[PDB]
């Protein structure tokens, strides 16, 4: 009758059309029949038989296909039909890097199989676990699956694990690949499927021991390209004008607009809606609906982007505009897009090795990203892609390809997270794109020195507790230990201020004015108490009365950095309350307030101490000849100083310095 891991495409197709739903035993709805008719035309259904032949004689396979081929919403169904999980109490997990994609695809698959969402097919996001004991298919964020692996190393509850959007090369995806390549050895019945959108995936095959590859033939129409003849100063106004022009003159077909973030998206939505209403009023053009799309949208708002374009009423075509943000690129596909507007800027994560801070900064996209954005333009008819930059910029300004997130993030937090999963041979761990051995060794050494990893290399309670926080383990350990010195709140503030980009702007011109503005806050003991003073003066009601933006601009302060610092401080306070960690403070008027703060601060930065040379300073670690930075507030000789940042120029410098008495070290 039905054989596990031995079915065929014909048997599955025949069982699909049966009047009885195999997974639940209820009656099929006509909606399911119509959806099946619509979705049977996708490219993957043609190769279904080849995929079945491949999935039975191998454990790991690579399935590469152009976006829109129907991989995330179809392949899991093929696996379900070939596996019959409900007869063995096992599930199938598909990992989506993006939360919005996971939720939307889960809802779509629930609709397709004619089963209520949350019963058979569900999703699992952080703080949102929409699933039950009857779930057979689960769409989960890669972070959530990593957490589950942390709880259950062997993943004994899953029979098949599908890694979607493997070309994004996020950190969680890389760790998951590295872990599964080894987990497969223990479990003979586990079956992996790596799915990618790049039609060239030779290196994936090489990494997975020459795993078989299956390619979906390209089905994208030609798309013309357009550029501007000069550089664009303001790209948001240019994007608005381009969208309005496209709606006014071009033919019928929806528009896709890529922007940076939530606030920009909302402002663009409002502006475009107002301009469209004015255009309809004055020129009598067709209606133009607007839908936003970003990470935090609720599902009832996410589902709106798929609604059909409004019917025309002015004798000209109606249109639908989706103001997306690097989610329409490859995560999900919208049917009906013919025109694409590509400002060229996207929000990317960057890491600063010297300060050890991760920030989300708007930077230009790579050539691959621009090519994918253009390709999104044509899938139904020959489309057009309008780029808001010069062709010379595209051919010279952009970078060939972006780097994997493993090389663009702290390598110590990554090690501390890997140790949670139970890995032992970190140096011999097989990463997709290994970092240089020097940095890995340095990270391991630093972690051992902080007591996060004991001499045996195993995790310790302090290590786990520090891992819970979103900070560099040094600052996390200092935060945990600060409660003993009766100055916990001050250290919390200082850590929050130190975990963000520099809050001072020091241009070449007006430098003396900036120095005076800093000295307004400066305390003649170190540059660390200065950050505390700046934060205290930032939230003072006097500043709010004066005007927060004006006050920040006048005093040469970075408002964005201080807002980020306040957000991080609130998050840290919440997290500290969560784990029941002692918090306290010393009265301001007490003479030992600064003594307490410096005592707690020296116990955390003991790894970075410099001594005043006889004669400017010599570091205790690595014995580097350095000079206090000119932008400093040190008052006295400061025989022993604590430095946070290292500045490399013709003459070495140390920045953010503060004094400390020898007895405290």
């Amino acid at each position: 009758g039905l054989q596990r891991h031995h079915t065929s495409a014909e048997e599955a197709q025949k069982l699909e059309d049966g009047k009885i739903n195999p997974f639940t035993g209820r009656e099929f709805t006509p909606k399911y029949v119509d959806i099946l008719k619509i979705r049977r035309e996708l490219p993957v259904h043609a190769q279904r038989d080849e995929f079945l032949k491949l999935y039975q004689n191998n454990q790991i396979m690579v399935f590469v296909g152009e976006t829109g081929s129907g991989k995330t919403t179809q392949i899991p169904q093929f696996v379900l039909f070939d596996e019959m999980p409900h007869l063995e109490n096992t599930q199938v997990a598909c990992t989506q890097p993006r939360r919005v994609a996971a939720m939307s695809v889960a809802q779509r698959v629930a609709e397709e199989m004619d089963v209520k969402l949350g019963e058979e097919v569900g999703y699992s996001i952080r703080f949102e676990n929409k699933t039950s004991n009857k779930t057979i298919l689960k769409y989960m964020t890669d972070g959530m699956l990593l957490r589950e692996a942390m709880e259950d190393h062997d993943l004994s509850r899953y029979s098949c694990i599908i890694l979607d959007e493997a070309h994004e090369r996020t950190l969680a995806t890389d760790i998951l690949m590295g872990l599964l390549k080894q987990v497969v050895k223990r479990r003979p019945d586990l079956k992996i499927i790596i799915m990618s959108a790049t039609l060239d995936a030779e290196k994936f095959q090489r990494y997975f021991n020459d795993a078989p590859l299956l390619a979906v033939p390209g089905r994208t129409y030609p798309v013309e390209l357009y550029y501007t003849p000069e550089f664009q100063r303001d790209y948001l106004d240019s994007a608005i004008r381009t969208v309005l022009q496209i709606h006014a003159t071009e033919e019928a077909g929806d528009i896709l607009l890529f922007l940076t973030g939530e606030d920009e998206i909302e402002d663009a939505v409002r502006k475009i809606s107002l301009e469209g209403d004015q255009l309809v009023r004055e020129e009598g053009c067709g209606p133009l609906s607007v839908y936003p799309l970003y990470g935090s949208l609720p599902p009832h708002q996410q589902q709106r982007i798929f609604e059909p374009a409004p019917e025309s009423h002015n004798g000209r075509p109606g249109r639908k505009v989706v103001i997306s943000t690097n989610i329409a690129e490859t995560s999900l596909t919208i049917d009906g897009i013919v025109y694409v507007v590509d400002p060229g800027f996207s929000k990317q994560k960057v890491y600063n090795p010297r300060i050890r801070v991760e920030s989300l900064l708007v930077s230009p996209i790579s050539k691959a990203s621009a090519q994918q954005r253009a390709g999104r333009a044509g899938r139904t008819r020959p489309g057009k892609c309008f780029r808001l930059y010069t062709e010379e910029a595209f051919q010279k300004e952009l970078i060939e390809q972006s780097y994997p997130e493993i090389l663009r993030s702290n390598l110590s937090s990554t090690v501390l997270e890997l140790k949670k999963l139970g890995i032992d041979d970190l140096v011999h761990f097989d990463f997709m794109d290994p970092p240089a051995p020097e940095t890995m060794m340095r990270a391991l050494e630093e972690l051992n020195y902080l007591a996060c990893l004991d001499d045996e290399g195993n995790l310790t309670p302090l290590g786990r507790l520090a891992s819970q926080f979103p900070l560099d383990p040094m600052l996390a350990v200092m935060l945990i230990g600060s409660f003993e010195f009766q100055c916990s709140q001050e250290i919390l503030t200082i850590v929050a201020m130190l975990s963000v980009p520099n809050v001072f702007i020091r241009p070449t011109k007006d430098k003396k004015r900036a120095d005076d503005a800093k000295n307004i806050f400066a305390h003649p003991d170190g540059d660390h108490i200065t950050l505390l003073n700046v934060y205290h003066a930032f939230k003072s009601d006097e500043a709010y009365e004066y005007g927060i933006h004006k006050w920040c601009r006048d005093h040469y302060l970075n408002y964005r950095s201080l807002s980020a610092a306040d957000n991080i401080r609130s998050q840290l306070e919440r997290l500290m309350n969560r784990y029941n960690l002692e918090l306290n403070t010393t009265d301001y008027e007490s003479p030992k307030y600064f003594d307490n703060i410096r005592k707690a601060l020296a116990s955390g930065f003991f790894m970075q101490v410099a001594k005043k040379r006889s004669g400017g300073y010599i570091t205790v670690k690595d014995n580097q000849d350095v000079l206090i930075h000119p932008s400093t507030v040190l008052g006295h000789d400061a025989e022993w100083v604590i430095y946070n940042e290292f500045v490399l120029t013709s003459k070495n410098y140390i920045r953010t310095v503060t004094s400390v008495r020898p007895e405290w070290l």
């Binding site: 152009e66 033939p217 390209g218 089905r219 994208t220 129409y221 030609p222 798309v223 013309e224 390209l225 357009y226 550029y227 501007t228 003849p229 240019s238 004008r241 381009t242 309005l244 022009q245 006014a248 253009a374 390709g375 044509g378 309008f386 780029r387 062709e391």
Partner: peptide
Amino acid sequence: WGIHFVKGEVLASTW
């Protein structure tokens, strides 16, 4: 309106 464009290259069909 207010933006003018210059035609560029064409991406051939992948069929």
